[PDB]
From a paper:
Dr adhesins are expressed on the surface of uropathogenic and diffusely adherent strains of [name]. The major adhesin subunit ([name]/AfaE) of these organelles mediates attachment of the bacterium to the surface of the host cell and possibly intracellular invasion through its recognition of the complement regulator decay-accelerating factor (DAF) and/or members of the carcinoembryonic antigen (CEA) family. The adhesin subunit of the Dr haemagglutinin, a Dr-family member, additionally binds type IV collagen and is inhibited in all its receptor interactions by the antibiotic chloram­phenicol (CLM). In this study, previous structural work is built upon by reporting the X-ray structures of [name] bound to two chloramphenicol derivatives: chloramphenicol succinate (CLS) and bromamphenicol (BRM).
Author numbering:
A (entry chain A), B (entry chain A), C (entry chain A): 0 to 138
The structure:
């Protein structure tokens, strides 16, 4: 029931815009609110564990990225939420516990964690959304 | 007369130094104050609009980057200014309005916005200067 | 006895973890506390000076990275220290002065500054450590 910080941090960034999309500078993940349909993919999160043969790999979201067992991207102003679902691409079993996404079994797991839109949210206010996940293990 | 945020943010970074220039870490845009001559190029800003056939493409500078219809890079301490001119590389017509640089015509414009030194400023105090521009449209 | 800021900033980043290491997102410099052995290499810092034929090249650490003529990486919370040694890879002579690492001779020096662990610190609390160095010259 406890998470131990032991790994690097991965950041999932997304810019939400209207139909008229103006991309400035280098290419980045951007979408129109209309694209925020249920199950819509946001981006992958690579995970590579080492020396965790006797520990349950886990990812913890920043305090501003979870609440009520629900995960979500947060606008730069910490006001707007973009509810998402976290799910590995393989058939591995994971559990959610107060902002923590841990693996049900021990082992140095390596894989991809996909971030998807949880419920159609085409009304999402334009802005920059972020989801931060830190590597570690669960007990 | 109103700007709508709808796009990504582009950041133009520049480090001003003295004759003795000590570059630490990875290569970045750096110049000596003596290089801050009138019309001196600072860097390009790519712009790619989509779904703006009926909107006027626009770029808005951060509050700390404009004043009195004048644009300028700002030191990390928000104290020193480096006045610059914003101009597309093509023959397109643009207008400046209270920190907003919008296109005079509608259409999903794609192009390069150049940043140049506005007036010789070889006295610019050494430091890190930044100019942030956000994509959107004008009404 | 005085440092003049005149160059870019280089940042040395390191994530300290336990045996069970969970790497999230893109690859970054990460190590287990057990790897924090004396003289253990942390990372190189490239230095390229120009127009310093009559000046002593120098690197200044951020206020939070030095104290008592000692350099060290600092956790994101500014609480935990990771004492390190700064040493060029060549045979050049350098001096340490209140957070400043300057060259004993003048000239536009180009080289690599290595960051090593100063004394075994395998008890270092897991976290993200940073060491910021700014380019300039000494008088
Ligand atoms: O973005 C995702 N999937 C896309 C579909 O748009 C695609 O299937 C994909 C799969 C793996 C991947 N990766 O491993 O880097 C990247 C994209 C999910 Cl991982 Cl969120
Ligand atoms: O830097 C600029 N121009 C330089 C001249 O030093 C050069 O002409 C250039 C043009 C285009 C460009 N781009 O499109 O990426 C980059 C450099 C202006 Cl775009 Cl600010
Ligand atoms: O990391 C270092 N040295 C490593 C040993 O692990 C290696 O010798 C090295 C040397 C030079 C270098 N470089 O110049 O980029 C990188 C690694 C020291 Cl420069 Cl801190």
């Amino acid at each position: 029931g406890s998470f131990t910080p032991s790994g690097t941090t991965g950041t999932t960034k997304l810019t939400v815009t209207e139909k008229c999309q103006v991309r400035v500078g280098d290419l980045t993940v951007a979408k129109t609110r209309g694209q925020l349909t249920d199950a819509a993919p946001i981006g992958p999160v690579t995970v590579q564990a080492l020396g965790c043969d006797a520990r349950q790999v886990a990812l913890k979201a920043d305090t501003d990225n979870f609440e009520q067992g629900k995960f979500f991207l947060i606008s730069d102003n910490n006001r707007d939420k973009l509810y998402v679902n976290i799910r590995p691409t393989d058939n591995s079993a994971w559990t959610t516990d107060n902002g923590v996404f841990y693996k049900n079994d021990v082992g140095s797991w390596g894989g991809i964690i996909g971030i998807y839109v949880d419920g159609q949210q085409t009304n999402t206010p334009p802005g920059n959304y972020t989801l931060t996940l830190t590597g570690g293990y669960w007990a």
